[PDB]
Amino acid sequence: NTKRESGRKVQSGNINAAKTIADIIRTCLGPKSMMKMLLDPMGGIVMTNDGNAILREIQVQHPAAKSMIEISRTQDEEVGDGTTSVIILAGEMLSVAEHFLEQQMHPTVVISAYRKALDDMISTLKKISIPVDISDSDMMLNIINSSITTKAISRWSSLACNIALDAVKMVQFEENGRKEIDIKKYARVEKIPGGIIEDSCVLRGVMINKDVTHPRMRRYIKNPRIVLLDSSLEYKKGESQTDIEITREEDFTRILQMEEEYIQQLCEDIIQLKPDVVITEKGISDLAQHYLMRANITAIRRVRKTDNNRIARACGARIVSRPEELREDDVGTGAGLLEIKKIGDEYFTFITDCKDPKACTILLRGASKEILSEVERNLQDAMQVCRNVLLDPQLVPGGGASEMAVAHALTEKSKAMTGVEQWPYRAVAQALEVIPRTLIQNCGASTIRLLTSLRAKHTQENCETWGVNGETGTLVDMKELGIWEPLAVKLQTYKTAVETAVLLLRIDDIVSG
Template sequence: MFGGGAPVVVLNQNTKRESGRKVQLGNVTAAKTIADVIRTCLGPRSMLKMLMDPMGGIVMTNDGNAILREIMVEHPAAKSMIEIARTQDEEVGDGTTSVIILAGEIMSVAEQFLKQEMHPTVIISAYRQALEDLIEILREQVSVSVDTNDRQEMLKIVKSCVGTKFIRKWSDLACQIALDATQTVALEEGGRTEIDIKRYAKVEKIPGGTIEESEVLKGCMINKDVVHPKMKRKLTNPRILLLDCNLEYKKGESQTNLEITKEEDFMKILQLEEAYIQSICEDIISFKPDLVITEKGVSDLAQHFLVKAGITAIRRLRKSDNNRIARAVGATIVSRTDEIREEDIGTGCGLFEVKKIGEEYFTFITECKNPKACTILLRGASKDILSEVERNLQDAMNVARNVLVDPRLVPGGGAGEMALSCALNEKSKSITGVTQWPYRAVSRALEVIPRTLIQNCGANTIRTLTALRAKHATEGNTTWGIDGESGNLVDMKDYGVWEPFSVKAQTYKTAIETAILLLRIDDIVSGTKKQLDTQGAPQAPPAGGPEA
C-alpha cells in the first residue's frame, strides 16, 4: 500500500520521459520554430506560403491561422502554439500572425533566465504583472475612442486590416463590403450589440467576372431554382412562407406492410395520399403566399396544386440558409402546415428573382426593407483567388465587428507595441528584486512586431528601430510607427493605420498566457506502444533509422 494517496507514475521500457531544464528549453525552441515559420507573413510586404494538403489541394495564403491549420507537428508545445492561433481567430478574428510571433518572442526572452537557473515561477510572476500593467497602459494611455457612426473613419480602420492582405489592390471595395455587411447584421438586444457574422453574413463565391463586380446584397442569394417550370421566376413584394416540413406523402418505414387484395384498395391508397397532399396544400394556399420555401421535399402533386394557385416553390434548402432568409424578410420558420399564422408570413422582401449565372441558377431575395442578414456575392477569376479573397474579407468583417462592439483604437504599424515597450521599460525601474529582469524582457519582446515589419520590407533594422525608440522616448509620441510599405517612420495619426483595441488586448493576453503555460511545464511523459509483428515480437525500426 502507498500512503498519502500520491499519484504513482509507472515507467516501463516503452515510456519516454524528459524533465526539468531540458523540457523547458525544448518548449522554447518549439515556440521559436513555429514563430519563424510565419514571421514573414506580417505586414503589407508579407510573403505568401504555398500549402499542399494530403488530398493534393493547394492553398496560397499569408493568413497565419490558415497556414498553421495545415501544418503537421509532433512536439506538444508546438501544438499549443498552433492552438492559440485558432483561439485568436475564433475570439476576435484577426491578429493570428501577431499572436504567434509575440508568443514565440516572449518564450525566446525567457531562455536566458532558464539557463541562468532562475526558477520558472519567478519568471511567470513577472510576466503576469507585466500583462496586467500592459493592458492598463494600453487602455488608459495608448488607445483612443472612435465614433462608430463616422463612415469614413470606420473605412480607414478596416483598410488598415486589408492593407496587409491579397485584396489590398481592391481595398476600397473590400472595406465597403465588409463594413456594409457587418452593419447589416448588427442587432441591438438589451442594450448591447450582437453581431453574428458567421451565421448571418454568408459569402457566396461564383467564379467568373471580375472582383469589381462583388457586392453586398440587401437580402439573400441561394444556389436553387424553382421546382416547376411553370412557376414565376420574378416577383415584386412577395409574401414569403418558410417551412421546415415535407410537402409530400410520408412513406412508412421498412417494417410497414400493406396487403392489397382488390384493385380498388390500391386506388383507395392513392386517393388517401392525394387527399393528404391536397389538405396540406390548402393550408398553405389559404394564407395566399407568393413564394413557399421548404427545407424538405415537394412532391409532384403538391407542385401541381401550388402552380394552380400561382405560388412559386423552392425546396431542399439548407437550415442555415433558411435562417438567414427568415432574418432578412421578417418571417418565422413553420414546422407544420396546420400551425401557420398570418404573422409567420415574411413581407420584408422587395424583389424575388431567379437568374442564371454561368451554367447554374441562383435565387435572389433582395431589396429587403430591414434585412438583419445578408449575402456577400464574390466574383473573381478562379476558385483559389476567391478563397483567398473570402479569408481576407472575413478578417476585415471581424475588424469592423470588434470596433462596433468596443469602439476603441490603438495605433498600428508597431506604434502600439513600441509605446507599451517604452512604458513597461520605464515602469521596470521601480520594481526591486530579481523579477525586474523578466519584466523588462517582456518590454523588449514587444519590439518584435515593429522589428519584423522593418525586416519584411527590407529596411535597415537596427537604424530604424533605434530611431523609433528615440521617438517614443519623447513624451506624447505614442503614435509613431513603421510604414510597412517603405520601412520609414510615420505618425500613424496622419498615416491612418489603426487597429481595434479588443484585437490588441486579446493578442497580448493570449501570447503572454501561453508563454506562462509553457514555462510551467517541467515534465513530458509519453507512453508509446511498440509495434508488434505477426509473431508477436517487437519489430525492428526501418533501415533508414527512426522516422522524423
C-alpha cells in the first residue's frame, strides 16, 4: 500500500523484538537451561527447552521475530541443534553494537565489520580444532555422548552411540568418492513397534517396512531383486466392462471388484516367472497381496520412483522382469546383512548396506511406546555428531569458552587493524562473551569478575583449551571435562548469525501489499 516508516524507529524496533527473544533462550541454553513457559490463550501450560515450539504456536511479531524463525528453520533442517544458539547471537549483536553506531549513523561499516568478524573467527577456530579418530568409535563415542547429555537422560545414550556411529559413515553422496555431512532424506529416524533395547540392532542400511508382513512372502534371499513391469507384471488394471446401471447400489461395488480381479491376473505371471520382490509405485490393494503369497513374493507399495533406484544400487538388487530372462543386471552385492524380524503380525525387513547412496532409515527400539520416542530423540542428537565427525575430524573444546576465544581474537585484531573499522568490529566482540557469562550466571558467582578471568585466561596460557565449566562456573580443561563443542555448529551458527544481523540492519521499512 502507501506506507513509510522513518528509519531509526524500525531498526530500533528490530532490536526490541530480537533481544527479548534472545533473553530467555540464552537462559534456556545448554545444561543451564531454563524453561520458556507459554500459557495457552485457551488455557493450558507448555514449557520446553525449545522456543521454536513456543514461538511457532504463538503470535509472532512482525519486525524481526519473523526472520528469526526463518533462520531457525534452516538451522533446524541441517543439523537441528543450534536453533537456540543462532537467535541469541544476532540479537545480542543487534542490541550492543547498533545503537551508538546508529548515533554515528553508518549501516555499511557495520556490515563490513561482520565480514571482518567472520574471517577472524575461522583463523582462530582451526588452530584449536582437535582431530579425533573417525576410525575409532570410542574417540567418536566421547563427543556423541556429550550432545546427548544436555538432558538428564543418559541411560540409553550408549544405545544411541552404537547405531549412529556406523550408519552415517555408510551414508555418502551420489558422487561416491566423497564423505562429509549426510542428507536428511538419506538418513532418517523411525520407531519400530514393541521391541527392547537388547534387541535394538545396529542398522547402517535401509529398512523397507512396506515389504513382507506375512511369512508366505519372500524368506531370506540375499539379493531381493525389485521387479518392475513388462514381463511379470503387465499394463492391464481395468475392468471387464459390465453394464452401467445408474439405479443400483451393487453396480459401483462390482466395478471395483472387477478392477481387483485384473490385478489378480497381473500376479499370475508373478507365479509363473518367479520374482522375489515386486514393486508398485501407485500402491496395490491388500487383496492383491494375498495372491502374491501364492507366488511367495513380497510386495512394495505406496512408494515412489526414486526410492527404488537408491535401494537397488545399495542392497545389490538387480532390476529384472524375469530371473530367467535377464536384463544386464546391476551389482550383485552391496549388502552386509539380510535380516527380517517380526513384531506381532508385522515383519520389518532390514538390509545393511555398505558405503551406498541409500535412503537410510535406521532401527531403534526402546521399552514402551513413549520410550520408543526417547530413543528416537537420542538418535537425533547422535546424527548431528556423526555428520560433523564425518565433516570435521578436527573440532574445538569448549562450553562457551570458545565463544570467548572468538571474542578475544576479535579484540586483538580490533586493536591491530586500527582505523574506522574497529569500532563496529570491537562492539560485536563484546556481544559474544555475554552468552557464556549467562551460562555461568546460572552456575552462580561474580560472573563479571569471572568474565575478566575468562579474558586473562585467553591470551596468557590457553584461549579456551583450558576453558570454563558451564555447570559449575569454574575455569576447567574442556578436554578433561569431556564436554566438546561441535565444530560444524561453530561454523554454521556463526555464519547464520552474521547474515541475519546484516539483513535486520538494512531494513527500515515494511509494507503489507
